[PDB]
Each structure stands twice: as structure tokens, then as C-alpha cells.
């Protein structure tokens, strides 16, 4: 055929969760490989990250050569950065799948039964997921898209300008205003809000499933998702407020 539209090919969870071989379900540990190094380099930023490269390459290794929790965590982050909330959700579905199907074999394998160290990249992902959720756009209008973090910043700016009206120019410079966000929200479609609230609920479902699988598998050594959950609740409450203001039932 001719090249498919869009930036990456469908990630294909069935294929991602198919064992590499019957003899070695998770394949070998590929940390030392050229392909793994290239992924690590692509994600490095102060150098800008190449998130598209990460999606294609981490996905390629997972589908063909190895089941690796580091790669799955990195693919989750890169999908979130490339695709938004739905990418974060697909990543969490993959993580849950790998813990369900490959607990005994996925790389890195445990050393001295240090399950905590084995899951360190997952523990990092909780904090990272809070950042990613707070960057999800709550508007798409007037040549801009504003996040939860943007709303909080705009609130903080309005407060500081009330306290310090002499420096209002410098306080407001290069930061969102409340009026600006409001105007962007006013010309954001209903369709945008349907999908945001649906996409947020599907994220919550994936987070719950992953956490549940981790209590089963890891017990006392399960990473916390408290940061991620606290963020989700802030984002969803704002999302629902903006939708209702815009006429969403
Ligand atoms: Ca790119
Ligand atoms: Ca811990």
C-alpha cells in the first residue's frame, strides 16, 4: 500500500502481549543493545527529546524481541507526549498486561527478590503521570490550548497582581490570564468536552486496573499512585467545570 496517515502505526496490544517464544516468553534482556541505547538517547532532553522515535522503537522491541518494563514505561510516557490522554491510557493498559502475563519473566528480572527495585521505573511513572495529566488541555480555541497547570498559574497571577499592582506588567508577561483561558474555553467545542471527559474516565479505569494488578503481584512493594490520583481528581473536576460552563450536560 501507501504510507498510513498519522504519526505512528497502531500499537496493537494483542501483539504486544504475545510471548516472544514459548521457550523464552520475554526474550533476552536488551539493555546493552544498540537499539536500547538509541531509545535512551531519544528520550534525553535538557538536546530535545524525539518522542516519535521512542514510540516506534520501544514498540518495535516489545513486539519483536523482548518484554521489558523499562521500555513499557518509556512507551507510556512517549505516547502521552505524542497523543495526549489516550496515549497515557493505552500505556497503562500495556503495563497492566505485562504484569498479568509476564510477571515471572519480564526484564529486568528480580535480584535478591528486591521487587521494589524491579518496579522503580513504575514508581517514577506515578510522579511523571501527575505532570502529564496537569498538561492535558482543558480548552482548544482562540489559537491556544490551556491546561490545569495553566489555570492554576492564571489564578496565581491574578492574586499576585491584586497584592502587587505596581509590578502587574512583569507578573503577567508570558503567563496565561483568567480572561484568556475563559475566551479560549468559550470557543471550544462541545465535541472537545465529550471526548475529554470520556478519555479521562477511561484513564481512571486503566489506572485502577493497573494498581489492582500491582497489589496482587507486588503486595507491600507496590509503588504508590497517590500523586497521579490526586492530579487526576484536580484535572477531572476542572474539566467537568469547563464542560458545564460551555453547555455540556
Ligand atoms: Ca516528531
Ligand atoms: Ca516503594
Author numbering: -7 to 38, 52 to 254
What does the paper behind this entry write?
The structural studies presented here show that TssA1B, TssA2A and TssA2B possess structurally diverse CTDs that lead to distinct overall architectures for their respective complexes.
SEC and two-hybrid analysis of the overexpressed Bc TssA1B Nt1 domain indicated that it is monomeric. Analysis of the crystal structure of the TssA1B Nt1 domain, determined to 1.80 Å, revealed a monomer composed of 11 α-helices that are organised into two subdomains, an N-terminal subdomain 1 (Sd1) connected to a larger subdomain 2 (Sd2). Sd1 (M1-P113) is comprised of five antiparallel α-helices (α1–α5) and contains the ImpA_N1 (L8-I31) and the ImpA_N2 (D55–P113) motifs. Sd2 of Bc TssA1B (L114-Q251) contains six α-helices (α6–α11), of which the three longest (α6, α10 and α11) form a five-helix bundle with α4–α5 of Sd1. Residues from ImpA_N3 (R123–R133) form the start of α6, a helix which includes a sharp kink between L124 and G125. The C-terminal helix of Sd2 (α11) terminates at Q251 and is thereafter followed by the connecting interdomain linker to the CTD. The sequence conservation in the ImpA_N region across the TssA clades implies that all Nt1 domains are closely related and adopt a similar fold, which includes the entirety of Sd1, and the N-terminal part of the first helix of Sd2 of Bc TssA1B.
